[PDB]
Symmetry: C4
Subunit: 400 residues, 4 copies
């Protein structure tokens, strides 16, 4: 850092932000956030763990699936509504939990998020971070409609009386579920944070320094089963990264699983969820677990075609973290309902072009997976050979 850099940010941000109808993609918000957030806002929000390979891979794995559209289908009308955990949604996507929304929206934080999700014609579920800057209560209450669903995302405390009280205050507030996050027993190392944070004593800590009393690094399957007895809210495990765990989730009867790697902020070299979903849906089908568990997916969703690809492989919904945080930060609640409109229209426009008219018609045979597994690395390309080499050239232009 903040080298009285605000003068520029602020200027940068001065009705400088282009109007909202100039916004085209979910990438526009991101480029906008990248310029106008504070350094600490950008580093926290945008970073992934270590080399950020997983974070990037989450997005690219969607780039390896192609479609097999049907033509000559009457697509005058399309429906994109579905049911996620007993409830019925207008769209098959949601706002995932992201701690610290005030870094970006200092006056309204997550309140603004609730607003955008319910103030327009499309109403979208909002997952609530146990690490939210605002309180559950200011949040559930800020929702402008009574048709909008809210989900509580829980981190279990090492002091479990705290998660007792917690669960109890969330069911009395009307959240429709609990997402239990399991991929952060220890905190991933986001080097972007730390770098800017070296800007120049705790009292002991080493790798240990990444441990936390808020995240019982001791959670187990067994704690999940004790949780089912203390509540009515359907239970969803957030952070599954292999098939065998998904099969564990059904074996002990939770309601869902979210195939997630924390948006690439936890273990680097975890696979894209999109690929775990694909390995996974058929295994479940094969043992009779498919009507038994709803599988969610998050990580690198930036387009409606990405949403349609996770939906054809079997997902019930798919979540988005960063795009919303960015929309929320340059334009508050209005930037958020706009990001929702952008998404909703890509899905519908894409659906007509694939030749289907409802979510239930989304199936794997609309996809080409041939190259999903073509995650590759080439041989270090040859310097000396590419350097002296000169390629073709176009026709110049002319005289004067």
């Amino acid at each position: 850092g903040e080298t009285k850099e605000d003068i520029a940010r602020k200027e940068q941000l001065k009705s400088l932000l282009p109007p909202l109808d100039n916004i085209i993609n979910l990438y526009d918000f991101e480029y906008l956030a990248s310029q106008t957030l504070t350094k600490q806002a950008w580093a926290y929000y945008s970073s992934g763990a270590n080399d950020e390979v997983t974070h990037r891979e989450n997005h690219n794995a969607y780039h390896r699936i192609f479609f097999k559209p049907k033509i000559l289908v009457d697509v005058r009308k399309v429906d994109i509504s579905t049911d996620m955990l007993g409830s019925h949604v207008d769209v098959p996507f949601y706002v995932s939990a992201t701690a610290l929304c005030k870094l970006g929206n200092p006056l309204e934080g997550e309140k603004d998020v609730a607003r955008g999700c319910g103030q327009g014609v499309t109403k979208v579920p909002q997952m609530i971070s146990t690490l939210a800057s605002c309180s559950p209560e200011e949040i559930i209450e800020a929702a402008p409609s009574d048709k909008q669903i809210q989900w509580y995302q829980l981190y279990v405390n090492s002091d479990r009386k705290i998660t007792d009280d917690l669960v109890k205050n969330v069911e009395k507030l009307g959240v429709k579920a609990l997402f239990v996050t399991v991929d952060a027993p220890s905190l991933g190392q986001r080097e972007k944070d730390m770098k800017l944070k070296f800007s120049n004593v705790e009292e002991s800590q080493g790798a240990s320094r990444a441990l936390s009393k808020f995240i019982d690094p001791s959670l187990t399957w067994k704690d999940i089963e004790e949780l089912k007895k203390k509540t009515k809210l359907p239970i969803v495990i957030k952070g599954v990264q292999r098939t065998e765990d998904v099969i564990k989730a059904a074996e002990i009867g939770v309601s869902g699983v979210v195939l997630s790697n924390h948006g690439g902020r936890q273990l680097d070299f975890s696979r894209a969820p999109i690929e775990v979903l694909a390995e996974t849906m058929p295994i479940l089908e094969q043992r009779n677990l498919k009507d038994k568990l709803e599988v969610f997916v998050d990580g690198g969703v930036r387009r409606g075609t990405d949403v349609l690809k996770a939906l054809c492989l079997g997902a019930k919904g798919v979540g988005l973290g960063r795009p919303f945080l960015y929309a929320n930060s340059c334009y508050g609640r209005n930037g958020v309902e706009k990001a929702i409109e952008i998404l909703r229209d890509e899905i519908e426009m894409s659906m007509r072009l694939l030749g289907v008219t409802s979510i239930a018609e989304l199936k794997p045979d609309l996809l080409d997976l041939s190259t999903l597994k073509a995650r590759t690395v080439g041989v270090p390309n040859d310097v000396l050979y590419n350097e002296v080499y000169e390629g073709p050239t176009l026709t110049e232009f002319e005289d004067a």
Copy 2:
């Protein structure tokens, strides 16, 4: 745009200046007034360019970009209010279309101001694209050049041809080579054709599509031209401009929500002498071309729908069309094998494996790979000789055409290259584009040691890396950044 005049009404610059909002929009096109309110949501070109030019003389934006027969045909008689009393407050009269064009017409007009190399210096098709990019208006560049969303299909169309290699034959007598073939019952001097494209007037305002008709039928080598339903020229003018009685014309049909209109357009085109009907089926909803959009707001879902392109067409409609006409029907926009088979079941004459130049669905596959898996499956069901299979998207070299012809396609189309040869040099740029390509095909055929189209077969190809469409692991920035490559020898003087 004509008039129709009625004979009287009698409008005025404030009676008309008054309706300058949707809920009613009136516009002056020439001397006449029109209520475009009920029409705007359907405009093939977007509801905005009209909505935002509300009650004005739009004359200068409309005149140059449209076919002479639009108003007659698509506007109800009741929408032609009246003749405009004299003129309009001036600066209520719109200038010509060039979103973003920053008084930039001078470098560009100079840029082709005979800065354009002689046509004889053109070596390849990329040369037309390079020249067009520097001289078309920012907005004709974006219209012509973009693809849907992220543009992965558009690039993939091209790229898939580079995953194919050849296994040429050596010591074969290649003195004589024949590239002539038959497409839909006619003999053609070549295996490629000029695909349907709208708005040829944006880069060639004096002649649009009439110039494509000329450069395709004026020389020693004639090429079939596919005419769009949304062409900037009337079909009758494009046909009358044709120089041989030996050149072929095909019509690209977009089925209207109002079938009578379509019924009517079919009957007209058979009378004008086109020889085939291509029904485009990959655009029930308008592809989102972002470079373009961005230019407009910087220089829904149902806003992508238009009555002009029925979102409701079905196989059944195809089947009814065939009882209504003797021209062979081709389905254009087919993107998977299952629809090719269906096309064979209903009995049409062919299909175009296309994704529309990559301007519709992004993640749609390269037609060359759909071709590779489709043909073997057609042979298995003995449906191979009962349907002709064309393909288009990203075809820039003679070896590209050959690759398609060895896989079983009957002909290949091109859209973008001819737009750019037509926009930089008109008719002779079209003619030069045809000569560049014909030569490339002859030249590569001698080199592959085959002497006729009939000889092109799958054995001349190496297909082992066709499905090697891959994505790399994001690799290490942090590591490759700290690294230094080797280094060649420097010299001493320098």
Copy 3:
């Protein structure tokens, strides 16, 4: 271009060229040639056909083969000598024919080539272009030693009396073989040439304009068989690009085949010879054709490991075109014997490190082919996503 640009070339070339002992690789010559040749010299020599994909692919295909070296082998001594068409060579590489060596060496042309090949301790065969700037006779005669072998590379004329006389003048001169080039029945289009050549009427020609009376586009297998009767020189077909032709060469009894695509100057999208050799050697083994035909290979050879890879797959020798032309052009006959020394030492140094001591020990199990076929093309990478994205960053440095 020649915009009286010579003043600079010439300056550039003025004892500016670094001494010969400063030369490390075959790429050094190339970068040197790239700066000091005339525009017409560089365009002719360095170009390939159309997009130049084959030309590049010739080199990269060698980059997809890895080795499985043997350790603990006594490699104090190595021998790299072998026999190519009855004769015995010091090295298992040769100088292939390249028309127009005077574009680069205006005073000595191909004479200088003969010299370099025979004036040092290592003597290498020199293939002679039917389109050589100097005459066979000035060439055979310029060879400084009587141990050096010379090969005649033949283009058959549409007027066959000319190739009668031709063959006869070459056997009387003592060339030890005839290489018949078959991959140029029509001339490939090297756009680099043509571009610079537009620098601003024949009397008819079109694709036809690429035909030539010197290259009977009418040669056939049958003409080859008539050729065998008119001579004693073993016959080698130059320009085979698939396996079925190689099997045709043995079926009619020629002595060799050169797996070649003209250095990427003929048909674009022809495969790397290195890969055709690999498909090919085992087919031959399988029918008993292997002691019957010697297979040569050329195209993108720039290192001794490339030579060892073609030799482990079965090749008898391998040829080099451009590197020599470049050596010949910046330093004449001396640049050529130096390029030979550079190569010879990479082979020997590489052999010790693979654990073998003679050419006959080079075998496919010293190679890993797993990924030879991994010639791939990725999906157009995403602009908007890579653009806003920022990777990690190193530690800066400090104060003042």
Copy 4:
């Protein structure tokens, strides 16, 4: 370098200035004269630096880069002519070594002039490499950093670790994690070690390898250090510098052509207390590091051979060595499964799957893939628990080590990172490098949900793209050049 003095002779600056050519070369090292003619072709560092410094005071080039015991040990008594009469014409006295260093010692000496961030600001191992690159001499940078020829192996070593993904376990109690293991009969606090590297004096001239001994045994976490036969410090000094009696030392052996010498070095090292002998076998001939060479001539085949590294070692020599010593023998430089099996047949205790940091044979494979195909084959023959398998090359992150440990390696070595932590910060940079890595391993283990080395198994890995080492078709320059990407939204003020 000592002297030995004899007692008399009595040389002079012209008697010695006179032999300034090969065929005889004499040099003044300190106060004494030596005929280096018969020796130069063997110099581990190249025949040139000596040949070209012919009859001079080379004192300033030799003193700082060599172990104190070289002259005693490798030069015959007859080569120590005599004490030099006083001094030498000056400018016959060589300056210190820094090929290319253009009076550039000032930006660099300032550059670390406390321009070097506090050690506490170091986040990863790439940070040491970045800092070293800016502050080492051009020639210490090239020595340390290059690989053989085109450098494909060196990059491939690193890259192959990025083709491996994990399948982590969720809901496992990860409060406690243990990373301690056993390597060659000893208990080690961690699964990695510091590999043998020559010339630690180039980046750390005051202490070289004695600083690596300190940063590996001074803290709470001790790490095995592998000492090179070609180290810049005497083995006895490197061992005496060690701070714990709990830290382990291993000796890297290069077999001489003169076996007595080797016989002698083995016996010395067992007496000093090293605990294992690593015989390096991948360098019978010296790898051609081009960045380095280029610096020298810009700032054969048998010239790559030296008596110091017998090109003649065989399995049989390995087998004889084992009768001569009780230390466990490791073969270092193994690059294919067949040699691992052979190592198991002769009964040695382990091997290092290595290609030498990519400094020897270019096209040699990544040790991580040789590991992946080797272990399953060892299990089949039940040879798995009879040989310990180490691996080195391009290991920069804790997830890299884990990947190796899940595949069955017993420990992983690192060479370059410690060179650079030692050259920028000495002992505490070594200690900090060990703490960075230990933490990364603990941190990733919690996240993979395992709690001990013993739990790391192949099921925690996704290996499906390990052999996806690929090369793309040269793609189209001519086409991708004429193309424009989409474009994000701009802002208005800017």
